[PDB]
């Protein structure tokens, strides 16, 4: 089977700048009829893939000509002349010259924007949950950029690594930022034995850790 | 308007089989090849097979011979793909697509795709989630704007449906991807509103879990 190699894995580009993606195949994609069946697809976040180009450089109907394709033999390139917000997603090259059809690994295009510090919110366990003998402390770190962030949980000044469940959103189309959720789950009994619960983030936008905490007590 | 609608998410037991459907409309079903593609853990697609509904002619990727069987019902304009003896590798999202290559013209017509069908191969039992309201104490973000949340935990399998005020509230919400842990998924969503909205008017978290026929609304009270 033809191995299709795409580089780079990810590219961060600012709106208005050009972007190019490379695709290499292990066999020439020149079919015996002289045509080269190399296609490019875009899979936007939460959407099905969509073909942008066919036959190396032919645009599909309704595709903007900001997008251009080129190459031959085993080397192909997709170029976006001016990146717009709607270009966010994973780009894949797929060959149709040699059966069976094979895809490249994909290239994620991320919109490079101005740094944004996280908005951190912390939530103690709900009454409903405590009733069940469980306790989850949640921390939302919303709208930050770059995506790189490290969050630790500290209970009464000591780092807690067990019981932590983290989740991140894909880059937001509306503002190009990322959001993350971190949940620390303990038993109701242990939760009630400690006082200070701290959600601590490490991010480029700060020389010191970004902290959000609460102290439980009674009243 | 050309449309391809695929069937719902499937939870399948190891070793059994499933039949996925791809109902089409808006075009002459018999005149175009229908292809099936597989996607595992994001970036990484695989071409499975294609069928010409007009003749029933099918071509398979060697890898999938014996795994997939494509059929098509002309009277209903529905393509089907049956997957047999499911194993770990079969857990994935499957798409059907009227790819659009016209062999006679050696050129392409627009490609239309189905929304995808998620297949989970597991022997784990279906479990209804617990929905917990997250009212701030420190997740207040002071005045101006306050952010509320909804914690959905302990359910299986995916997916779960989460909206705010029946969909009325869609801007400023962040729904995080579910994470599996100890055979149960946990998912959360945050919503940021102006201090003038909450607690004044109510914010409600709506959750639906088809697999267990669970539908729950949690009102975020102070
Ligand atoms: O097989 C041969 O030798 C001759 N080649 C042909 O007839 C060309 C076939 C048309 C084509 O572009 N196929 C590639 C392809 C098809 C479907 C697809 N998808 O994702 O659905 C992705 C890629
Ligand atoms: Zn060949
Ligand atoms: Zn061949
Ligand atoms: Zn050959
Ligand atoms: Zn201690
Ligand atoms: Zn102590
Ligand atoms: Zn303690
Ligand atoms: Zn020509
Ligand atoms: Zn064309």
Short mmCIF file of C-alpha atoms and ligand atoms in Angstrom, two decimals:
data_model
loop_
_atom_site.label_atom_id
_atom_site.label_comp_id
_atom_site.label_asym_id
_atom_site.label_seq_id
_atom_site.Cartn_x
_atom_site.Cartn_y
_atom_site.Cartn_z
CA UNK A 1 0.00 0.00 0.00
CA UNK A 2 1.22 3.54 -0.65
CA UNK A 3 2.43 5.30 2.48
CA UNK A 4 1.45 8.99 2.51
CA UNK A 5 3.59 11.30 4.70
CA UNK A 6 2.40 14.78 5.71
CA UNK A 7 4.48 17.49 7.27
CA UNK A 8 4.24 19.37 9.44
CA UNK A 9 2.05 17.65 12.05
CA UNK A 10 0.71 21.02 13.18
CA UNK A 11 1.18 24.58 11.98
CA UNK A 12 0.14 27.70 13.86
CA UNK A 13 -0.53 30.58 11.52
CA UNK A 14 -1.85 34.05 12.10
CA UNK A 15 -4.93 35.17 10.19
CA UNK A 16 -3.79 36.79 6.96
CA UNK A 17 -0.58 34.83 6.62
CA UNK A 18 0.06 32.07 4.06
CA UNK A 19 0.38 28.39 5.00
CA UNK A 20 1.67 25.40 3.08
CA UNK A 21 1.33 21.70 3.82
CA UNK A 22 3.48 19.00 2.31
CA UNK A 23 2.45 15.49 1.30
CA UNK A 24 4.87 12.77 0.10
CA UNK A 25 4.01 9.29 -1.21
CA UNK A 26 6.04 6.09 -1.34
CA UNK A 27 5.10 5.50 -5.04
CA UNK A 28 4.63 8.02 -7.85
CA UNK A 29 0.96 8.92 -8.04
CA UNK A 30 1.06 9.20 -11.80
CA UNK A 31 -1.62 6.83 -13.06
CA UNK A 32 -1.13 4.95 -16.35
CA UNK A 33 -3.60 7.28 -18.05
CA UNK A 34 -1.22 10.17 -17.24
CA UNK A 35 -3.49 11.71 -14.57
CA UNK A 36 -2.50 12.06 -10.91
CA UNK A 37 -5.28 11.24 -8.45
CA UNK A 38 -4.11 13.24 -5.43
CA UNK A 39 -6.81 14.86 -3.29
CA UNK A 40 -6.81 17.17 -0.27
CA UNK A 41 -9.51 17.13 2.39
CA UNK A 42 -10.25 19.35 5.37
CA UNK A 43 -11.96 18.03 8.47
CA UNK A 44 -13.23 20.96 10.51
CA UNK A 45 -13.73 20.43 14.24
CA UNK A 46 -16.82 18.32 14.80
CA UNK A 47 -17.53 18.01 11.07
CA UNK A 48 -17.12 15.26 8.48
CA UNK A 49 -14.13 15.58 6.11
CA UNK A 50 -14.68 17.60 2.89
CA UNK A 51 -12.72 17.57 -0.36
CA UNK A 52 -10.97 20.81 -1.23
CA UNK A 53 -8.89 19.71 -4.22
CA UNK A 54 -8.84 16.82 -6.71
CA UNK A 55 -6.38 15.96 -9.50
CA UNK A 56 -3.55 17.74 -7.67
CA UNK A 57 -4.62 21.30 -8.38
CA UNK A 58 -8.28 21.36 -9.30
CA UNK A 59 -10.50 23.07 -6.76
CA UNK A 60 -13.83 21.56 -5.90
CA UNK A 61 -16.87 23.69 -6.49
CA UNK A 62 -17.48 26.19 -3.72
CA UNK A 63 -13.90 26.03 -2.46
CA UNK A 64 -12.10 29.41 -2.18
CA UNK A 65 -9.22 29.96 -4.59
CA UNK A 66 -7.15 31.23 -1.65
CA UNK A 67 -6.40 27.50 -1.55
CA UNK A 68 -4.00 26.17 -4.14
CA UNK A 69 -2.56 22.72 -4.78
CA UNK A 70 0.49 21.58 -6.71
CA UNK A 71 3.16 18.92 -7.14
CA UNK A 72 3.77 15.70 -9.10
CA UNK A 73 5.32 12.26 -8.79
CA UNK A 74 5.65 11.80 -5.03
CA UNK A 75 5.69 15.41 -3.77
CA UNK A 76 2.60 17.56 -3.34
CA UNK A 77 1.76 20.84 -1.62
CA UNK A 78 -1.39 22.57 -0.50
CA UNK A 79 -0.97 26.30 -0.09
CA UNK A 80 -3.37 28.74 1.55
CA UNK A 81 -2.51 32.26 0.32
CA UNK A 82 -4.17 34.12 3.19
CA UNK A 83 -5.38 32.21 6.26
CA UNK A 84 -8.87 32.98 7.57
CA UNK A 85 -10.58 31.73 10.76
CA UNK A 86 -12.63 29.14 8.84
CA UNK A 87 -9.42 27.31 7.79
CA UNK A 88 -8.97 25.77 11.25
CA UNK A 89 -8.94 21.97 11.13
CA UNK A 90 -6.98 18.94 10.01
CA UNK A 91 -5.87 18.71 6.40
CA UNK A 92 -5.35 15.31 4.79
CA UNK A 93 -3.95 14.25 1.45
CA UNK A 94 -5.38 11.02 0.03
CA UNK A 95 -4.27 9.23 -3.14
CA UNK A 96 -6.56 7.42 -5.54
CA UNK A 97 -3.98 6.14 -8.08
CA UNK A 98 -3.08 2.88 -6.42
CA UNK A 99 -5.62 0.52 -4.91
CA UNK A 100 -6.28 0.52 -2.03
CA UNK A 101 -6.71 4.26 -1.40
CA UNK A 102 -4.59 5.64 1.41
CA UNK A 103 -4.57 8.86 3.45
CA UNK A 104 -1.75 10.87 4.97
CA UNK A 105 -1.65 11.25 8.76
CA UNK A 106 -3.11 14.75 8.71
CA UNK A 107 -1.84 18.28 9.48
CA UNK A 108 -3.63 20.35 12.08
CA UNK A 109 -3.78 24.05 11.34
CA UNK A 110 -4.12 26.23 14.41
CA UNK A 111 -4.75 29.95 14.36
CA UNK A 112 -1.94 31.78 16.11
CA UNK A 113 -3.28 34.64 18.22
CA UNK A 114 -2.28 37.04 20.98
CA UNK A 115 -1.64 35.41 24.34
CA UNK A 116 -4.65 35.18 26.60
CA UNK A 117 -4.56 34.45 30.32
CA UNK A 118 -7.03 31.88 31.69
CA UNK A 119 -10.19 32.80 33.54
CA UNK A 120 -10.24 30.26 36.37
CA UNK A 121 -13.37 29.24 38.27
CA UNK A 122 -13.41 26.71 41.11
CA UNK A 123 -16.42 24.74 42.38
CA UNK A 124 -16.81 22.78 45.61
CA UNK A 125 -18.83 19.51 45.52
CA UNK A 126 -22.61 19.89 45.17
CA UNK A 127 -24.91 18.82 48.06
CA UNK A 128 -26.44 16.24 45.76
CA UNK A 129 -23.06 14.63 45.22
CA UNK A 130 -22.04 14.73 48.87
CA UNK A 131 -25.23 12.81 49.67
CA UNK A 132 -23.93 10.02 47.42
CA UNK A 133 -20.73 9.71 49.47
CA UNK A 134 -18.64 11.29 46.73
CA UNK A 135 -17.02 14.67 46.24
CA UNK A 136 -15.62 16.32 43.11
CA UNK A 137 -13.93 19.72 43.13
CA UNK A 138 -13.98 21.25 39.63
CA UNK A 139 -11.78 23.89 38.11
CA UNK A 140 -12.45 25.55 34.74
CA UNK A 141 -9.59 27.39 33.05
CA UNK A 142 -11.36 29.20 30.25
CA UNK A 143 -10.09 31.04 27.19
CA UNK A 144 -6.33 30.96 27.26
CA UNK A 145 -3.66 30.97 24.57
CA UNK A 146 -1.16 29.32 23.99
CA UNK A 147 -2.70 25.91 24.68
CA UNK A 148 0.28 24.88 26.83
CA UNK A 149 -0.73 24.95 30.48
CA UNK A 150 0.06 22.83 33.53
CA UNK A 151 -2.46 22.45 36.37
CA UNK A 152 -1.86 20.90 39.79
CA UNK A 153 -4.23 20.42 42.69
CA UNK A 154 -3.15 21.19 46.20
CA UNK A 155 -5.00 20.16 49.32
CA UNK A 156 -3.87 21.83 52.53
CA UNK A 157 -0.64 22.75 50.81
CA UNK A 158 0.23 19.31 49.45
CA UNK A 159 0.02 18.24 45.81
CA UNK A 160 -2.65 15.68 45.05
CA UNK A 161 -2.09 13.56 41.93
CA UNK A 162 -4.62 10.80 42.38
CA UNK A 163 -8.25 11.37 41.44
CA UNK A 164 -7.57 14.08 38.82
CA UNK A 165 -9.47 14.02 35.53
CA UNK A 166 -8.54 16.62 32.85
CA UNK A 167 -10.22 17.56 29.59
CA UNK A 168 -9.45 20.21 26.94
CA UNK A 169 -11.53 21.74 24.18
CA UNK A 170 -10.28 22.11 20.61
CA UNK A 171 -9.34 25.63 19.51
CA UNK A 172 -12.41 27.85 19.57
CA UNK A 173 -13.50 29.25 16.19
CA UNK A 174 -14.97 32.38 17.76
CA UNK A 175 -11.83 33.61 19.51
CA UNK A 176 -9.04 31.08 18.86
CA UNK A 177 -8.60 30.31 22.53
CA UNK A 178 -8.58 27.00 24.41
CA UNK A 179 -10.50 25.99 27.54
CA UNK A 180 -9.75 23.19 30.03
CA UNK A 181 -11.59 21.44 32.84
CA UNK A 182 -9.90 19.72 35.77
CA UNK A 183 -11.85 17.60 38.24
CA UNK A 184 -10.47 16.17 41.48
CA UNK A 185 -12.68 13.45 42.96
CA UNK A 186 -12.40 12.16 46.53
CA UNK A 187 -14.70 10.37 48.93
CA UNK A 188 -17.11 12.48 50.96
CA UNK A 189 -15.27 11.53 54.15
CA UNK A 190 -11.82 12.55 52.99
CA UNK A 191 -13.14 15.77 51.48
CA UNK A 192 -14.48 16.70 54.90
CA UNK A 193 -11.10 16.15 56.54
CA UNK A 194 -9.27 18.89 54.67
CA UNK A 195 -9.69 22.65 54.52
CA UNK A 196 -8.01 24.37 51.55
CA UNK A 197 -8.54 23.12 48.00
CA UNK A 198 -6.35 24.83 45.40
CA UNK A 199 -6.37 24.71 41.63
CA UNK A 200 -2.97 25.99 40.48
CA UNK A 201 -2.06 26.70 36.86
CA UNK A 202 1.24 27.34 35.15
CA UNK A 203 0.97 29.38 31.96
CA UNK A 204 3.14 31.55 29.66
CA UNK A 205 1.06 34.62 30.60
CA UNK A 206 2.42 34.55 34.16
CA UNK A 207 5.80 34.36 35.90
CA UNK A 208 4.04 32.95 38.97
CA UNK A 209 1.41 30.22 39.25
CA UNK A 210 -2.19 31.26 38.62
CA UNK A 211 -4.23 30.28 41.69
CA UNK A 212 -7.86 29.77 42.57
CA UNK A 213 -8.83 28.27 45.90
CA UNK A 214 -11.48 27.86 48.52
CA UNK A 215 -11.48 26.93 52.16
CA UNK A 216 -14.30 24.81 53.45
CA UNK A 217 -15.36 25.17 57.10
CA UNK A 218 -18.83 25.41 58.71
CA UNK A 219 -21.47 28.20 58.66
CA UNK B 1 -30.34 19.13 -1.55
CA UNK B 2 -28.21 16.03 -1.47
CA UNK B 3 -28.19 14.39 1.97
CA UNK B 4 -26.70 11.28 3.59
CA UNK B 5 -28.05 10.40 7.05
CA UNK B 6 -26.29 7.71 9.06
CA UNK B 7 -27.63 5.64 11.93
CA UNK B 8 -26.95 6.25 15.62
CA UNK B 9 -24.07 5.34 17.88
CA UNK B 10 -23.66 1.62 18.53
CA UNK B 11 -22.41 -0.21 21.62
CA UNK B 12 -21.39 -3.73 20.48
CA UNK B 13 -20.24 -6.75 22.39
CA UNK B 14 -16.88 -8.25 21.38
CA UNK B 15 -17.34 -10.96 18.77
CA UNK B 16 -20.76 -9.91 17.59
CA UNK B 17 -21.62 -7.92 14.44
CA UNK B 18 -23.48 -4.69 13.49
CA UNK B 19 -25.09 -3.29 10.41
CA UNK B 20 -24.68 0.42 9.81
CA UNK B 21 -26.99 2.37 7.56
CA UNK B 22 -26.51 5.40 5.35
CA UNK B 23 -29.80 6.72 4.01
CA UNK B 24 -29.48 9.06 1.04
CA UNK B 25 -31.69 11.60 -0.67
CA UNK B 26 -31.53 14.40 -3.19
CA UNK B 27 -29.90 12.48 -6.01
CA UNK B 28 -30.21 9.39 -8.18
CA UNK B 29 -29.00 6.78 -5.69
CA UNK B 30 -28.10 4.23 -8.40
CA UNK B 31 -25.81 6.45 -10.43
CA UNK B 32 -23.01 7.08 -7.94
CA UNK B 33 -20.47 5.04 -5.99
CA UNK B 34 -20.85 5.11 -2.22
CA UNK B 35 -17.64 4.74 -0.23
CA UNK B 36 -17.16 3.89 3.44
CA UNK B 37 -14.28 5.36 5.48
CA UNK B 38 -13.07 4.62 8.99
CA UNK B 39 -11.65 7.07 11.52
CA UNK B 40 -9.89 6.07 14.75
CA UNK B 41 -8.73 8.48 17.48
CA UNK B 42 -8.83 11.62 15.33
CA UNK B 43 -6.36 12.15 12.51
CA UNK B 44 -6.13 8.81 10.78
CA UNK B 45 -8.61 7.76 8.10
CA UNK B 46 -8.78 4.46 6.27
CA UNK B 47 -10.65 3.64 3.12
CA UNK B 48 -12.76 0.50 3.52
CA UNK B 49 -14.78 -0.22 0.38
CA UNK B 50 -17.11 1.19 -2.30
CA UNK B 51 -20.32 -0.02 -3.84
CA UNK B 52 -22.14 0.98 -7.02
CA UNK B 53 -25.82 0.75 -5.97
CA UNK B 54 -26.95 0.43 -9.58
CA UNK B 55 -25.28 -2.91 -10.11
CA UNK B 56 -24.31 -3.98 -6.60
CA UNK B 57 -20.68 -4.05 -7.70
CA UNK B 58 -18.30 -3.67 -4.68
CA UNK B 59 -14.54 -3.31 -4.19
CA UNK B 60 -12.83 -3.88 -0.83
CA UNK B 61 -9.59 -2.85 0.77
CA UNK B 62 -7.87 -6.24 1.33
CA UNK B 63 -7.58 -5.42 5.03
CA UNK B 64 -11.37 -5.42 5.33
CA UNK B 65 -12.35 -8.43 3.23
CA UNK B 66 -14.32 -10.61 5.62
CA UNK B 67 -14.70 -7.74 8.09
CA UNK B 68 -17.06 -5.52 6.08
CA UNK B 69 -19.94 -6.39 3.76
CA UNK B 70 -21.56 -3.60 1.76
CA UNK B 71 -25.10 -3.82 0.41
CA UNK B 72 -27.54 -1.24 -0.86
CA UNK B 73 -31.31 -1.08 -0.96
CA UNK B 74 -32.36 0.68 -4.15
CA UNK B 75 -36.01 0.80 -3.20
CA UNK B 76 -35.11 2.90 -0.18
CA UNK B 77 -31.87 4.53 -1.36
CA UNK B 78 -30.01 3.19 1.65
CA UNK B 79 -26.47 1.79 1.69
CA UNK B 80 -25.49 -0.58 4.47
CA UNK B 81 -22.25 -1.85 5.84
CA UNK B 82 -22.23 -4.88 8.09
CA UNK B 83 -19.19 -5.38 10.30
CA UNK B 84 -18.56 -8.90 11.56
CA UNK B 85 -16.86 -10.36 14.62
CA UNK B 86 -15.99 -7.04 16.19
CA UNK B 87 -12.77 -6.53 18.08
CA UNK B 88 -10.78 -3.67 19.63
CA UNK B 89 -9.67 -2.16 16.31
CA UNK B 90 -13.27 -1.86 15.14
CA UNK B 91 -14.16 0.82 17.66
CA UNK B 92 -14.24 3.92 15.47
CA UNK B 93 -16.35 6.43 13.62
CA UNK B 94 -17.53 5.24 10.21
CA UNK B 95 -18.54 7.60 7.41
CA UNK B 96 -20.34 6.92 4.18
CA UNK B 97 -19.76 9.38 1.34
CA UNK B 98 -20.99 9.91 -2.22
CA UNK B 99 -17.38 10.65 -3.18
CA UNK B 100 -18.23 12.04 -6.62
CA UNK B 101 -15.61 10.62 -8.96
CA UNK B 102 -17.23 10.02 -12.35
CA UNK B 103 -15.14 7.38 -14.13
CA UNK B 104 -16.43 8.28 -17.63
CA UNK B 105 -15.52 11.96 -17.20
CA UNK B 106 -12.29 11.25 -15.31
CA UNK B 107 -13.34 14.17 -13.18
CA UNK B 108 -15.20 14.81 -9.91
CA UNK B 109 -18.58 16.05 -8.86
CA UNK B 110 -19.15 17.42 -5.30
CA UNK B 111 -18.61 15.02 -2.43
CA UNK B 112 -21.36 14.67 0.18
CA UNK B 113 -20.79 12.95 3.50
CA UNK B 114 -22.88 11.35 6.22
CA UNK B 115 -22.41 12.64 9.78
CA UNK B 116 -20.55 9.54 10.97
CA UNK B 117 -21.48 6.57 13.16
CA UNK B 118 -19.52 5.87 16.36
CA UNK B 119 -19.16 2.16 17.19
CA UNK B 120 -17.94 1.17 20.66
CA UNK B 121 -16.86 -2.44 21.08
CA UNK B 122 -17.11 -3.31 24.78
CA UNK B 123 -18.68 -5.78 27.16
CA UNK B 124 -19.19 -3.08 29.88
CA UNK B 125 -22.72 -2.41 30.99
CA UNK B 126 -24.77 0.66 30.22
CA UNK B 127 -24.79 3.09 33.13
CA UNK B 128 -26.93 6.24 33.61
CA UNK B 129 -25.01 9.39 34.57
CA UNK B 130 -25.36 11.49 37.68
CA UNK B 131 -25.80 15.20 36.87
CA UNK B 132 -24.45 17.71 39.42
CA UNK B 133 -24.98 21.51 39.38
CA UNK B 134 -21.91 23.69 39.87
CA UNK B 135 -22.84 26.95 41.54
CA UNK B 136 -19.90 29.23 42.42
CA UNK B 137 -18.46 30.03 45.81
CA UNK B 138 -15.05 30.83 44.34
CA UNK B 139 -15.98 29.91 40.74
CA UNK B 140 -17.83 33.20 40.92
CA UNK B 141 -15.31 35.28 38.94
CA UNK B 142 -16.47 38.15 41.19
CA UNK B 143 -19.24 40.36 39.79
CA UNK B 144 -19.64 41.45 36.14
CA UNK B 145 -19.77 37.87 34.88
CA UNK B 146 -20.24 34.64 36.80
CA UNK B 147 -19.62 31.15 35.46
CA UNK B 148 -21.75 28.15 36.32
CA UNK B 149 -21.12 24.53 35.45
CA UNK B 150 -22.67 21.13 35.04
CA UNK B 151 -20.93 17.89 36.06
CA UNK B 152 -22.07 14.71 34.31
CA UNK B 153 -20.40 11.65 35.75
CA UNK B 154 -20.51 7.89 35.87
CA UNK B 155 -22.17 7.02 32.60
CA UNK B 156 -21.55 4.47 29.86
CA UNK B 157 -21.42 4.45 26.95
CA UNK B 158 -21.04 7.67 25.00
CA UNK B 159 -22.75 9.87 23.97
CA UNK B 160 -24.53 12.17 26.40
CA UNK B 161 -26.41 15.33 25.31
CA UNK B 162 -25.93 18.58 27.22
CA UNK B 163 -27.63 21.94 26.65
CA UNK B 164 -28.31 25.04 28.72
CA UNK B 165 -31.87 26.37 29.02
CA UNK B 166 -32.99 23.93 26.30
CA UNK B 167 -30.51 25.34 23.82
CA UNK B 168 -31.65 28.91 24.47
CA UNK B 169 -28.27 29.56 26.07
CA UNK B 170 -25.53 28.63 23.62
CA UNK B 171 -23.02 31.47 23.62
CA UNK B 172 -20.41 31.46 26.34
CA UNK B 173 -20.78 27.72 27.02
CA UNK B 174 -17.87 25.26 26.93
CA UNK B 175 -18.64 21.57 26.81
CA UNK B 176 -15.60 19.47 27.48
CA UNK B 177 -14.91 16.11 25.82
CA UNK B 178 -15.86 13.15 28.02
CA UNK B 179 -12.95 11.27 29.58
CA UNK B 180 -13.15 7.57 30.38
CA UNK B 181 -11.97 6.40 33.77
CA UNK B 182 -12.74 3.07 35.48
CA UNK B 183 -15.23 2.06 32.79
CA UNK B 184 -17.24 5.26 33.27
CA UNK B 185 -17.15 8.58 31.44
CA UNK B 186 -17.19 12.03 33.02
CA UNK B 187 -18.07 15.20 31.13
CA UNK B 188 -18.46 18.81 32.22
CA UNK B 189 -19.73 22.06 30.72
CA UNK B 190 -19.28 25.66 31.85
CA UNK B 191 -21.45 28.67 30.98
CA UNK B 192 -20.58 32.27 31.62
CA UNK B 193 -23.35 34.80 32.12
CA UNK B 194 -23.55 38.41 33.29
CA UNK B 195 -24.08 38.97 37.03
CA UNK B 196 -27.39 40.54 35.95
CA UNK B 197 -28.61 37.22 34.57
CA UNK B 198 -27.88 34.88 37.48
CA UNK B 199 -29.26 34.32 40.14
CA UNK B 200 -32.00 36.67 38.86
CA UNK B 201 -33.24 34.37 36.09
CA UNK B 202 -32.69 30.60 36.09
CA UNK B 203 -29.97 28.70 34.30
CA UNK B 204 -30.70 25.05 33.75
CA UNK B 205 -28.45 22.27 32.58
CA UNK B 206 -30.23 19.68 30.38
CA UNK B 207 -28.71 16.24 29.92
CA UNK B 208 -29.80 13.29 27.83
CA UNK B 209 -28.21 9.84 27.68
CA UNK B 210 -29.98 7.82 24.92
CA UNK B 211 -28.28 4.55 25.78
CA UNK B 212 -29.96 4.47 29.16
CA UNK B 213 -32.97 6.56 28.18
CA UNK B 214 -32.06 9.14 30.79
CA UNK B 215 -33.11 12.78 30.49
CA UNK B 216 -32.38 15.15 33.36
CA UNK B 217 -32.45 18.88 33.95
CA UNK B 218 -30.52 20.45 36.79
CA UNK B 219 -31.33 23.98 37.90
CA UNK B 220 -28.22 25.77 39.13
CA UNK B 221 -29.38 27.21 42.44
CA UNK B 222 -27.14 29.52 44.51
O1 LIG C 1 -8.00 2.19 -8.56
C1 LIG C 1 -7.37 2.55 -9.61
O2 LIG C 1 -6.43 1.87 -10.05
C2 LIG C 1 -7.75 3.78 -10.44
N1 LIG C 1 -8.10 4.85 -9.75
C3 LIG C 1 -9.36 5.32 -9.82
O3 LIG C 1 -10.26 4.77 -10.51
C4 LIG C 1 -9.64 6.62 -9.00
C5 LIG C 1 -10.74 6.43 -7.97
C6 LIG C 1 -11.30 7.75 -7.44
C7 LIG C 1 -10.54 8.34 -6.28
O4 LIG C 1 -10.26 9.52 -6.25
N2 LIG C 1 -10.18 7.48 -5.32
C8 LIG C 1 -9.48 7.82 -4.21
C9 LIG C 1 -10.40 8.01 -3.00
C10 LIG C 1 -11.73 7.56 -3.03
C11 LIG C 1 -12.56 7.76 -1.94
C12 LIG C 1 -12.07 8.41 -0.81
N3 LIG C 1 -12.95 8.66 0.33
O5 LIG C 1 -12.48 9.16 1.33
O6 LIG C 1 -14.15 8.38 0.29
C13 LIG C 1 -10.76 8.85 -0.77
C14 LIG C 1 -9.92 8.65 -1.87
ZN1 LIG C 2 -0.37 0.67 -8.25
ZN1 LIG C 3 -3.72 -0.39 -9.02
ZN1 LIG C 4 0.52 -0.22 -11.59
ZN1 LIG C 5 -2.50 17.23 55.32
ZN1 LIG C 6 -2.35 18.24 58.56
ZN1 LIG C 7 -5.60 18.12 54.77
ZN1 LIG C 8 -8.14 17.19 -19.91
ZN1 LIG C 9 -12.64 18.72 -11.76
#
